[PDB]
Amino acid sequence: NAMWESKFVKEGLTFDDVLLVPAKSDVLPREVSVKTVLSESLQLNIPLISAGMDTVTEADMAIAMARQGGLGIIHKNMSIEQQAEQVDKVKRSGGLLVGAAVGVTADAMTRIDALVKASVDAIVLDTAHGHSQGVIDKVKEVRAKYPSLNIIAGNVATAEATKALIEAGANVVKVGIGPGSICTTRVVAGVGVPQLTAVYDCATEARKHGIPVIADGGIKYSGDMVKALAAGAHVVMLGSMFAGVAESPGETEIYQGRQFKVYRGMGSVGAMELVPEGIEGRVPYKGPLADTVHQLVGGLRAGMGYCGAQDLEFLRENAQFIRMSGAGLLESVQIT
Amino acid sequence: SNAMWESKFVKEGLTFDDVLLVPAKSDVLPREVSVKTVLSESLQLNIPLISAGMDTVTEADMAIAMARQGGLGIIHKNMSIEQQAEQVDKVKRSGGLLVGAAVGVTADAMTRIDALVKASVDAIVLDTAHGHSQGVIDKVKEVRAKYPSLNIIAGNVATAEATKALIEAGANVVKVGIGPGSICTTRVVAGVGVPQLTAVYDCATEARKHGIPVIADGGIKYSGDMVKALAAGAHVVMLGSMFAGVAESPGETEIYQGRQFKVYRGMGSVGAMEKKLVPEGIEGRVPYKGPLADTVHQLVGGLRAGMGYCGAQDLEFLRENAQFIRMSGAGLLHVQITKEAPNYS
Amino acid sequence: FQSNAMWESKFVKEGLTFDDVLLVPAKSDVLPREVSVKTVLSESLQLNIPLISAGMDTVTEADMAIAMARQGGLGIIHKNMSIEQQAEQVDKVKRSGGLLVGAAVGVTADAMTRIDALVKASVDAIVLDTAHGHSQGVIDKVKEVRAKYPSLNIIAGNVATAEATKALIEAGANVVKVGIGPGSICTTRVVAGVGVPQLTAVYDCATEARKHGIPVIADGGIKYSGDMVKALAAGAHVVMLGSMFAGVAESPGETEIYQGRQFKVYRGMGSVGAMEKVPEGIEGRVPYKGPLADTVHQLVGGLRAGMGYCGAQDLEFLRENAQFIRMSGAGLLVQIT
Amino acid sequence: SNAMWESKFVKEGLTFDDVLLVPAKSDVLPREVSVKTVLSESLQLNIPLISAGMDTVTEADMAIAMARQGGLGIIHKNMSIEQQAEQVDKVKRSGGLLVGAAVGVTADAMTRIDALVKASVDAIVLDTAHGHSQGVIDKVKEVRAKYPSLNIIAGNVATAEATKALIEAGANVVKVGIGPGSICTTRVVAGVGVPQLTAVYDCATEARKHGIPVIADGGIKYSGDMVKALAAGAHVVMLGSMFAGVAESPGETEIYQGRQFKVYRGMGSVGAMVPEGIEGRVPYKGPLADTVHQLVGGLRAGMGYCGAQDLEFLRENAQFIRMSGAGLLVQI
C-alpha cells in the first residue's frame, strides 16, 4: 500500500502564491522579443491564443488575433461545413494562421479531413480528461494519417499524462484541469491541479522531448500570464479576457446602460444544448481586441525587463519565483 | 515524561477545501462506473449515500425515497420506541427496502433496539458525540452478544485508536466525524475536533486492517467534497444539510421573501433537545430543493465524473489508488455568474 | 570571530494562536458534568473555576469582584482609582462572605504605598501589571515586595517569553501573567509591531514555569468558550477575561442604547480615556449580556465538554495530556436563526 | 543544466503582516531611546524618516517640514532642472537644512546633477523600477567619478546581488523595494515583486558587509511596520502614502463626497507620466508633525519592548516570530 501513503504528500501552487524575482538586466522592455515557436509550421509573434469556445473565437476573432501576432482556435459547436468555411475564410484573409477545435467523436476523423483541406495550421484535440485511452488512440490515428499536421492535445494536469500524449503523436500539449473561470470541475468532481504547479510539472516532462506547453485558463491579469510563461509554458490561452472583445462572436447586450458580452463554459447547459462542469455568465464590453493585447504584451515586456529576459526561452529556463503567504498578496488607498 | 508535552502541536490537519483530486490514467467513462458499495455481508447499497438520523432530515418518507434511489435512511430517535418501530416497519412494508434507525447510549437503548429488530431493521446506528468511550464500547459489546447477526454502525470518532476500539467491540461499521457538521458548534464551544479529511483518512487506515468500512459524516457542501471523502478511505458518506431542503424530508415548507425554506437543526440544538444547557448545535433554514431524486442525481453525477478523472471503475479502486494534492488558501479562489430567477411556487 | 547568530535567527521562530489549532479527542469515560475544574494557584489561593476577571476600569470593581468570587472565580480590582478607594473596594468584597479578591498595582514610586494599604485590607493577591514585564524595573519591584511581604500572593506580567518567565519567577513571583499583544482592545501589534501569538506564548511560558511548579495565566485573546479550553490545555492553570465580562450586569458602568440595542463601554487601559483618568489601547462597545452567572455557566459548560472529549478528570490531566492538531485558514471555515 | 529549473519555486518571502517582534529584556524607557541614525559622514538624521520623491508627496514645503522634524525630504523630478534647483535652494536658505533631489537615468541626468550640486544638495536619489540594470550601474559610476563626495542613493533593488552591484558602482546608500508600494501594480501587471521584509533583510545582510545602510521604501501602512522594517536591517524608511495627506504636501485639500482628501498617485501612473502605478485619494491627515509624532511615537514603543537603546541595537538584535493569517486576526 505505497499508494495509501502518498495520498496527501503532493503540494500545489497557484498564480497568487508566487512572484517573479528581479535579476540582472541589460535589455529594455521595448527591446525584448516576445516571439515563440510551437513547431516549424507554427511561429507566433506574440505568445497568445484565444480559447476555442463559441463565445470567444470565430473567423473574425481568429483574423483579428492573427493580425496581432497570435492565433485563434475556431470552436467546434458548429457544423463541419461551417467550420471549414470559417477556417478557409481566415486563411484567405491574407494567409493568416488559424487553428480549429475537434472533439474526440466518431465524426472527428471526418471533421479533421475537412479542416486539413481548408488548410488549418493546427487542430486542437481537446477533452476534459486528456489522459484517457480514447484520446491516446485518437491522436495516434490522426498522426498516422497526417504526419505533418500540428496536433494540440489536452487537457492534462500531470507529467505522466503529458508523456502519454507526446508518444501518441502530439507535438503541442495543453495544460489545465480545474482552473478556468467558467470551470466548476473542482466544485462538482473534486478534481484539479493548481495551474502553476500543473504547468511546471508538465513542462518538466515536455522539456526533455522539446515539446511546447500551452497554459490554458485561470489567467486574470497580464501578471499571471508572465508567471505562466516563466513556469514553463510557451504560450497562454485565454477565454474570459477575450470574451468581452469586439471581435468575439455574439453581439453586445445592454443591461442598465452598461455593455456586456455573454461568456459561457463549453460544458455548461447552453453549449451542450452527465452533470455540467461549466457555467454561464456575463463579461464587461472591452472594445477593440488590440486594446487588450497591447496591455498583455506590454505587461509581458515589463516582466521580462525585470527578469533580464531577452527572449521567452531565457525566461522559461532562468526565471525565479518566490513563494509567499496569503497575507503576502494583500500587499499587492481608495482608487479614483 | 514530557513526551506528551512536546507533542502537543505536532499533528497537522486537512479538510475538504485544502485538497484536490489529481487526474490519473483512465479508460473508463462516467456512465460505466460502478457506484455500488458493500457495508457488510448483509447490507449492500446501490449508491454511497446515507441520509442522517436527524429529526429535520430523515423520517419514514425520506428512508423510503433514499432506499428507492439505492441508498439508506436512518430514522431518527427523537420519538417513542413505538412510533420509531412504526416507521421502520413501514419502510419494510413498501417493498422490502433497506432502512436504518438511530439508537443513543441510554437505558432504554435495548428496549428500543429490540422493537427495531422485531420490525426487521437492517442496521442500528449507535450515536454519541464522543464514541471513544468505554460506555459506548461496553454498549456495543452488549448488543453484539444479544444480536450476533445485526449490523451495528457505531460513532462518532476522529482517531485510529478510537476506530480499532469500536471494531474490537464488535461494530461492523465506524461513523467518522467530530466537529465538521454544518450546524455544529463543537469546535467553537469546546475547541474540540479534527479536520474531516484527516479524520476519515486516519480512521480508514486503521479500519482497512480489519476489513471494516467507515462512514464520512458531515461537512459536505458540494458533490466534490463527497468524491474527496470516498477517495480518502470512506465507503459511504452521510448527509444532513443537503437532504434537509428536499421535499421528502420531515418538516413543513415555510415562505420567506416569497421563497420557500425548510428548517435544518442540529440534534444538539435547543429546539431538538426540548422534543442551564450548553448546546453544541444550531437551528437554521435551508432552501426548498424539491424532490430527493433531483438532488441525488447531481451528487452521483459528480461522483461518476470524479471517478472518471481518477480512472476508478469502482469505489474500491478510488479508495485505494486516488491521489490528493494540497493547496494554500489562495488556491481555493472578472466573470459575473448568471443565475435564473427563483420559483415562488 | 564575530557571531552572526542573532542576525540569522531573526525569522526562525513560528507562532500559533487559538484559531490555528483544534483539540483532539481521546479515550474518555468521564462525563462533562462530573469533571473537576478546581484549580490551585497557591495554597493561599484556590479557585472553584479557572476564571479571572481583568483589572480594567470597564470590567472589574467591587460588585463584579464579588460576583466572580461567588461563582468560584476571582476578580482583580483595577488601579485606576485612589489608594484609599481601592482598599475600601477590596474590604467590601472581603467582608461580604469571606471571598477571595485581587488588586492591581503598577510599577510606580507610590506602588509600595498602595500595596500596604491593600495588604492591610486583607487582599489575597496583588497583580503587578506592566506593558513589558521583562524589564529591570519590574524585576527589582518584585524582589522589593517579596522581601517585605513574604506571605503575599504576587502576579507579575506581562510576559511572552521563557526567559522573561524565568526572570520573574527568580524574583519571587508565585503566578505569572502571559500575554503581549493578543488583547481584543489592544493595538500594541499595530502601533509597535510587537507581540506573541497567545497559544505559543502560553506554551513557551508554561514550559519554563513547569520546572518550578509555577502556574501561568492566559491574558486576553479569548473570544469563544472553546478558546479558553485551548488556553488551559496549552499549559495555563487559569485564564483572564476582559471583553467577555465587560458587557455584564455586574460590570462597572451603566447600559447604553445603540440603535435601540443595549450596550456597555469596554476600553483598554492604554486607551486615551483611561490614560487621562501614544496609545496602545482603544475604546469600544460590547453587547449587554445580562448577569455574570449565565456567561460563567456557558464558559464553564464549554470547558466541561472540552475536558469530556479529552478524557480529563481535572485541569491537570488536560494541561499535561491534551494533544492538538494544526489546521489552516480553510479549516476555520446555512441561514442561522 | 537543470539547476536553474529546479530552483524556481524554492525561495520563500515574508511581508510585514507575516511577523511580529518578540519582546526581549529591557532596561530602556521609550522616552530615553535614541532614534538618531547616520547614513553618511555628510548625512545624518534625527529621525529615520525620508519623504518620498513624488509629485504628490514632496516639494520645498514638504522638504522643509521634514527637515525640521528631524528627517529628510527628496524633491521630485517631475519639474524643470532649474525649477528643482530653485526648490533645493529655497530649503537650503530656510535654516541650513537637509535636502535631496530625485534624478532619473537619462541623458540630462548629469546636467541636472550639476545644477543640484550648484545649490549644495546633500544627496541625490537615482530612482528606477529596476536598479539592477547596467544603465543605473554605469550612471552611478560616472557620477561617483565626477562628484566623489556627493551622497548617492541608488535603487530600487530587492536582492543581495543587486545590492552588491550598486555598492561597487559607488552608491553610499541603497534603496530597497520592488512591489510593496500601495499605489503599485507591478505585481499585477508584471507578476514581479519581492515581499518587503525578506527584501530588506536580504539586502541588509549584504549591505552590512560594506558598512553601507539601506532604505526600506514602500508597503508601510502602520508605525508597527516601520519598527519591523528597521529591525530587519533598514537604517531608514521612505514613506509615500502616509505623507500625501498632510498639509505640507504639494497641491492642496480637495473634496470628495463632502469630505477632505488629497490626491495620491504613483510616478508610473497615467497622470504623473503601460501603467504600474495607480491614482487615488487619501484623507487629509492634517499637519506633518502630528503624523510624525505618532510614527516616532510608535518606534520608541517598539524599541522599548525589544530593549534597544539605539537603532543599531535593534538592527542587530531584534528577533521576529512568524505567524499565519488567522494570527493577524468588540465594535470599535
Ligand SMILES: Cn1nc(CC(=O)Nc2ccc3oc4c(c3c2)CCCC4)c2ccccc2c1=O
Ligand atoms: C471541461 N469540460 N467538461 C465537460 C464535461 C465532461 O466531459 N466531463 C468529463 C469528466 C470526466 C471524464 O473522465 C473521462 C472523460 C470525462 C469527461 C472522457 C473519457 C473517459 C474519462 C464538457 C462536456 C461537454 C463539452 C465540453 C466540456 C468541457 O469543456
Ligand SMILES: Cn1nc(CC(=O)Nc2ccc3oc4c(c3c2)CCCC4)c2ccccc2c1=O
Ligand atoms: C516603478 N515605476 N515604473 C515606471 C515604468 C517603468 O519604468 N517600468 C519599467 C518596468 C520594467 C522595467 O524593466 C527594466 C526597466 C523597467 C521599467 C528599466 C531598466 C531595464 C529593465 C515608472 C515610469 C516613470 C516614472 C516612474 C516609474 C516608476 O516608479
Ligand SMILES: Cn1nc(CC(=O)Nc2ccc3oc4c(c3c2)CCCC4)c2ccccc2c1=O
Ligand atoms: C455534538 N453533540 N453534542 C451533544 C451534547 C453532548 O452530549 N455533548 C457532549 C460533549 C462532550 C462529551 O464528552 C463525553 C460525552 C460528551 C457529550 C458523553 C460520553 C463521555 C465523554 C449532543 C446532545 C444530544 C444529541 C446530539 C449531540 C451532539 O451531536
Ligand SMILES: Cn1nc(CC(=O)Nc2ccc3oc4c(c3c2)CCCC4)c2ccccc2c1=O
Ligand atoms: C498595553 N499597554 N501599553 C501601555 C503603554 C506602555 O506603557 N507602553 C510601553 C511600551 C514599551 C515599553 O518598554 C518598556 C516599558 C514600556 C511601556 C516600561 C519600562 C521598561 C521597558 C500602557 C500604558 C499605561 C497603562 C496601560 C498600558 C497598557 O496596558
Ligand SMILES: O=c1[nH]cnc2c1ncn2[C@@H]1O[C@H](COP(=O)(O)O)[C@@H](O)[C@H]1O
Ligand atoms: O465547460 C467548461 N467547463 C470547464 N472548463 C472549461 C469549460 N469550457 C472551457 N473551459 C476551459 O476554460 C478555459 C477558459 O478559462 P479562462 O481563460 O479563465 O476564461 C478554456 O480555455 C478551457 O480550457
Ligand SMILES: O=c1[nH]cnc2c1ncn2[C@@H]1O[C@H](COP(=O)(O)O)[C@@H](O)[C@H]1O
Ligand atoms: O447538534 C449537533 N452538533 C454537532 N453535530 C451534529 C449535531 N447534529 C447532528 N450533527 C452531526 O452532523 C451531521 C450532519 O452534518 P452536515 O452533513 O454537514 O450538515 C449529522 O449526521 C451528525 O453526525
Ligand SMILES: O=c1[nH]cnc2c1ncn2[C@@H]1O[C@H](COP(=O)(O)O)[C@@H](O)[C@H]1O
Ligand atoms: O490598553 C491596553 N492595550 C493592550 N492591552 C491591554 C490594554 N488594556 C488591557 N489590556 C490587556 O487586555 C486583556 C483583555 O483581553 P480581552 O479579554 O481579549 O479583551 C487584559 O487582560 C489586559 O492584560
Ligand SMILES: O=c1[nH]cnc2c1ncn2[C@@H]1O[C@H](COP(=O)(O)O)[C@@H](O)[C@H]1O
Ligand atoms: O508609480 C509607481 N509605481 C510603483 N511604485 C511606485 C510608483 N511611484 C512610487 N512608487 C514607490 O512606492 C513608494 C511609496 O509607497 P507607499 O509608501 O506604500 O505609498 C515610493 O517611495 C516608490 O518607491
